[PDB]
Symmetry: D2
Subunit: 430 residues, 4 copies
């Protein structure tokens, strides 16, 4: 057991810091003047372009697939540094990574060659999206006896026809609402969409994932793909994640990611478990910005007293708590991503670790931001400091990427209740 | 011991609910279009007008002084209903109340008659402000050997001359930056503002409070009173609490609230202790709105499952923790304001109880809003629900009205450390 | 709304204190030399004797029934004082109170007069016990489709025959294992005990409560009523709540408490709800002793430094948190018991308030004891201080009287989910 | 970065597990019958003998000093397995390790060769004790202008004379109150012990460590070393940490660990910093036993319902929270001991990491035990389950080894307040 960083991992850190400082710091002056969520998102376009130019999109795809991703620890380091400065654009990079994951993870060399090509070119501003989330929710999408996903697909000849609405998927409508360069649309198979999911068939057996590109949307009637809305979010105000409606939206059979059923579900599960671990790095980045801002302040400001406020035990107690949360969180992320890369561990083991990581790091990040504000006091509440932005951004994390209460705690509970559950396999082996 | 409400307490609730429902609900339409903090405050003026017309400003003044305040429990009931709906204007009323408290509490019948007049009239939109807070902080304003308040006063002839800066005080610049109708300016006495506070002099012995009206300001040179800025707040985006500079600002000696010294400090301390108790009702109002919005959702929405989400043990646990926090908070506030009104108890007992109240209610109000959001899930993060507003609003409370970490816990610690401290005196008697 | 105590409330406190100080302080010298739970329980007989002599058992029965209970606030005040000194004997009194509650609550004046008789006499050491808890658990005793209670009753001729086992009920085997002077044995009605509970009938319709006295036991074969064992408890080491087997145990039909079904369930529910509210006073008593011991220590000990440790912000912070938990807890208890006594309120309102109180008071009491230990430091871990006993004692409360996790949160959840739920009805009315 | 365990690390776990299960499980039958703290301690002697025989005392000493300790991660693994089963005897072993640390960390080969010898022999039941703590407290022992340690020392001829009292030090009296085989006695230097510490001199400059063996004690008058008492503890009921009084107790100058002053204080700090990191594994063992008992119960008991209670969200939530605390705790411990072993890092960086580790792991262990008890319910409260023992044992951890409130939070705060404080140096290197 070793925690030492390789030269390539310290370089990744240096590269991410340089990009965030020289590029991402200029973003706010552009997006802040815009009047709504989409406009703010479109204002980030030049910065994403610079991310592509800096090789950061290509770094979201494994080397075997023509990308430059060195490992998930490198990835975790990059994301922490990025989110400690500016989640605008940073969020777009990782949302694209997620949107690429089902293609990355499938075992279809032709699909990989064809659909990952734009993202490994180092050109343009291509966006990917994993379109899973829906207006009615998704915590219960696999509940046997329940309605299931409300975006459905049926096969008609050599094509699939998609019917229904998505809500929340990042980048899903692309820069201009004519679509992400690649969307992986997750559907429930239904020959007759006006009828309820069969309560006697396992929902996981009816899952399909269809690859939709801008070409696919262009080859369809205009009214077959409509953007109905764009949520105004409490924080991450520069992201896009619209409300989309599919109506008789035709997709070539060749665009079907794999055979419908447990394998399709598994691709979705694996993608979202990988994101569950990586989200920890984002949360640490945000909470670290908070902690660091409060630490610098506490060590340089006396608040009209005789000594720097760090010298008061209650203030120090808050900063200690912040520090501990960030330290424990990073260790857990690095544990989780390494666990996920370990070919000798069973899925159950990797999944459970990923669930722990998402739950802990996101819950604790919020406490860290809030405790940092309390320590600084009143001055943390005005927008000449980072905290108002950080407070809104940090509340995203426990809720998104499969919220802790409805999704991640349930996924974990399910593993723990299996007769063969081995709690310590990721540490002490089977 | 009795918890039953009188018909007048019930009417106070009804009256406050109706005002919030019929008047306050219309405020957002007006302030949401405005570009900055001051503009948003100005947009709020017609609603403070209606609050005056509804008698709510007169209700901030005791009956023996020409006001209509029935009791502090009536007050606590009104504040909860207002803040449950909309802190805009509601904050202005309560900030005015605090700005009036030093005059309400003094032993000067002539001063009371003169200065409370416009506030008990039922007319106009008159604003009051207790101007204590400062750019450098105030947590250590009473520390012997420290720099002390940086807003100072010296007597010259039959006038006092104020030098220095205030920051944060609600309403202080009035509607137009020409002054609150009444500001109580808290100063440290210094015949030479260039020299440090005497470290062998108890800071409390040097406190003066000077009454400043729009007339006082108009009778001074142009740049003797300057508004240097207006903080943009995370929440309560329609209040005004500017950065003010006094330069050789002359005030008549007749406007000095009382003899400078311990009695002046006493009036400030007492006003802030009353507001420490009342603030709990504000926190309750915000957190209650969060709880109720989450509760309705939970009992009407299945999130794509087969049952309402309140039927999941994890969801119910969150709503349970919310309800418990709200219930204990309200009991504590009523206990505290009732203790304040009890002539048999000595100040230190009333003070310790008010500190507890402020600390508890404001800390747990934050947790209540956060748990409500975790129970609702992703939907809580978009502005078509209240939570984004409530999250920014609730974080004000542990920070403002004397922060828990620097001020209130320290005030409580000091009382607990006294040799004759009686922990249960507010309950079981001395 | 009023918090002021009457002369009788103040006398009840004074009386409880004198009894705790003069009588209870001497119990430890007797029970400490004993070898097992029963030996320790039996060694407290002389102190329960004194409690009866001080009228404390008679005080558990309302005045219309020949007892001296003044109110539930008086009761809460009494219990707080007793448990702040010594839970031994104190626990026996309140367990007797619980045992008597179903009789006190029933609609039969002749049952009341016959069975309550020895408890209002002021002589002897009468013990009562509500025999509900079982070896297999009780959290799901009313679950439709579940196995239900495993102590069952069938009617044969003019008598009932009880089959099965109880575990935990305080006082159940009396001083000598020949039985409590009054036991209320809660049973699932089953004509054939070898058959499972019918999954098609609502469990609450099958509840019956049978009154079992030392007479009943003497009138049965020696092997019909067996004590299989006595749990060795972490804390409250002088109580008795043994493992009891009923085999073909015959009970007169006259000794049936009421009609089986909802009526009998209602009496059990009501009894346990009242105890849910009163348990708060016991938890406060224990936590108060912890807080006050830490407080006195903090104010008199420098821990080899230059100042009393209460002058360290981290120490004060712990003491402040303790104080707040205690204050909020007592407010909630007094609110709940008052709510229980208000005939204008629906049962579900009283139930929900009782549930909140049990959950909150018992959870935070544990935190209060631990923090007080943290503040005192290493010294708190040795048995020359109260803390070791208090720690073990305090951990009983979240678990017993219906655990927070399996029972009270579930009872509260059920109420919150009802369509006609009124969260604030106990405060603001229906 | 790597989390995989080596064959020897995996073997250290199997070995520690086998010893706990075959040996330590039998301890209870012997100590449970005794009537007081010392008797219960004395009843564990045969189990400590077996620990020695299994090479576990030798494993508390670095290889270069003739011991068998392979690394602090190995140590962490061992302690977690031991404490998961039985802290009796396990506590004696680690308390000995701490008592050995000042000698292990000193720069005197002759002193190490001589004093560490019985402990690496693989025979007997040798005990070591770091005698720092005192009746009046030690949170403030280094406070300038404060009273300081009340165990003082003065040099008279070629000897040192110790005056004052210790309280709490593990094993300090040995098995029979004739002394631990090696005690490291931490003293404040004072020529006239009736005079207060000079408020103008830095307390750290006055620290001395004097080695005191059974021979030392035998060479003194009887009344010069007396045990005044033995605390009855809430938990870890089989350990000894007596109240000791030194009255004109003579020690050879040859037994002075190093020159009094900052270097002597540094050895104490480093020793206690190392133990701050290792304590985390002790707390993990205790909390882990709680988690595992609750998990087994939750997955095989319906509590009179129609499904196992782990199938209830609120029960799962407690087990999840326990699991997460345990996982985060072990990562932190392993990070901390790895940091401590990193020659490229500054002391302040190592210390800060050790403080964090101690504060977090020990606070969170307590929550883990209590949550596991809440999930099991009423049954966890009776002594036919482990929890009553685990509850009392777990509360020791935030309190001992320098309590979190008075000591470890203050040591950490002090580091954070320095101008050159580097928060992420143990992770991202120094700039
Ligand atoms: C890598 C990282 C990056 C990320 C980004 C993403 C994520 N996640 N994005 C997205 C995408 O892309 N795609 C998609 O699809 N999506 C998305 N998102 C969204 C998210 O994911 C979320 O999380 C979802 O939507 C889900 O949600 P939730 O909340 O979790 O769920 P719901 O269904 O809605 O529910 C709610 C609630 O309820 C309750 N429950 C239910 N059920 C249940 C419950 N409990 C218990 N149990 C049961 N069964 C609970 O409470 C819950 O909470 C997104 C978003 C955003 C904002 C962004 C920015 C992005 C994104
Ligand atoms: C009842 C209702 C009413 C409300 C309104 C008001 C209030 N409060 N307003 C005002 C007025 O009116 N006036 C005045 O003057 N002011 C005001 N404000 C402000 C507030 O009050 C606040 O709170 C103040 O500013 C204070 O703050 P703080 O934070 O508390 O303090 P400082 O000084 O800043 O400090 C900070 C921090 O630091 C630390 N420390 C210091 N010192 C110390 C410490 N610790 C410990 N120890 C010591 N010694 C801590 O951490 C702290 O925290 C206001 C405001 C607003 C926003 C509004 C809206 C309003 C108002
Ligand atoms: C007023 C004051 C007085 C008191 C005393 C009494 C009480 N309470 N005692 C008694 C009597 O008397 N009687 C009877 O019967 N009993 C008794 N106890 C006992 C108690 O009450 C307890 O609490 C019972 O046992 C119950 O328990 P719990 O725990 O709650 O339940 P279970 O069934 O066992 O369960 C466990 C667990 O699991 C889980 N779960 C289940 N289920 C479920 C769940 N979760 C969710 N959901 C569902 N459904 C949970 O976690 C739980 O926890 C007693 C006792 C003692 C110790 C004493 C001293 C006394 C008494
Ligand atoms: C790993 C290994 C393990 C081993 C074991 C040991 C440890 N720890 N042991 C011992 C030895 O060996 N040695 C010695 O010396 N000792 C010992 N111990 C004891 C412990 O360590 C403890 O921790 C000590 O004592 C310390 O305590 P504390 O608590 O921390 O302190 P003090 O002084 O007492 O204090 C208390 C309190 O107070 C307060 N404060 C003060 N000061 C201050 C404060 N605050 C804030 N600030 C300031 N400045 C606080 O709150 C505190 O808490 C031992 C023990 C035991 C039981 C065992 C079993 C073992 C041992």
């Amino acid at each position: 057991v070793d925690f030492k960083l390789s030269p390539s991992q310290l370089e990744a850190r240096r590269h991410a810091q340089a990009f965030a400082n020289t590029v991402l710091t200029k973003a706010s002056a552009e997006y802040s003047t815009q009047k709504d969520q989409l406009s703010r998102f479109q204002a980030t376009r030049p910065f994403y372009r610079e991310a592509v130019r800096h090789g950061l999109i290509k770094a979201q795809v494994p080397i075997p697939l023509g990308g430059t991703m060195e490992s998930l620890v490198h990835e975790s380091i990059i994301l922490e540094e990025l989110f400690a400065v500016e989640p605008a654009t940073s969020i777009t990079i990782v949302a694209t990574a997620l949107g690429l994951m089902p293609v990355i993870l499938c075992d279809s060399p032709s699909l990989q060659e064809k659909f990952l090509k734009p993202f490994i070119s180092g050109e343009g501003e291509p966006l990917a999206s994993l379109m899973h989330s829906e207006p009615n929710g998704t915590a219960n999408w696999l509940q046997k006896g329940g309605p299931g996903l409300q975006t459905t697909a049926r096969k008609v000849g050599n094509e699939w026809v998609i019917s229904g609405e998505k809500l929340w998927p990042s980048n899903s409508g692309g820069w201009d609402y004519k679509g992400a360069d690649l969307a992986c649309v997750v559907c429930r198979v239904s020959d007759d969409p006006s009828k309820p999911q069969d309560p006697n068939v396992d929902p996981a057996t009816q899952i399909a994932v269809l690859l939709v590109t801008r070409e696919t949307i262009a080859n369809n009637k205009k009214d077959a793909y409509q953007i109905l809305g764009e949520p105004e979010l409490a924080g991450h105000i520069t992201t896009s994640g619209p409300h989309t409606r599919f109506t008789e939206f035709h997709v070539p059979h060749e665009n079907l990611l794999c055979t419908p059923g447990l394998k399709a579900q598994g691709l979705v599960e694996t993608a979202f478990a990988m994101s569950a671990a990586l989200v920890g790095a984002m949360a640490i980045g945000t909470a670290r910005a908070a902690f660091e801002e409060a630490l610098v302040f506490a060590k340089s400001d006396t608040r009209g007293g005789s000594k720097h406020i760090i010298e008061h035990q209650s203030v120090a107690d808050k900063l200690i708590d912040c520090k501990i949360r960030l330290e424990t969180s990073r260790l857990l992320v690095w544990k989780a991503v390494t666990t996920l890369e370990d070919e000798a561990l069973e899925w159950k083991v990797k999944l459970e670790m990923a669930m722990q990581t998402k739950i802990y790091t996101t819950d604790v990040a919020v406490e860290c931001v809030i405790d940092a504000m309390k320590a600084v006091g009143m001055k943390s509440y005005a927008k000449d400091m980072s905290f108002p932005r950080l407070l809104n951004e940090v509340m995203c994390y426990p809720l998104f990427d499969g919220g802790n209460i409805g999704l991640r705690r349930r996924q974990m509970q399910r593993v723990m209740a299996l007769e063969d559950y081995e709690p310590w396999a990721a540490t002490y082996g089977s």
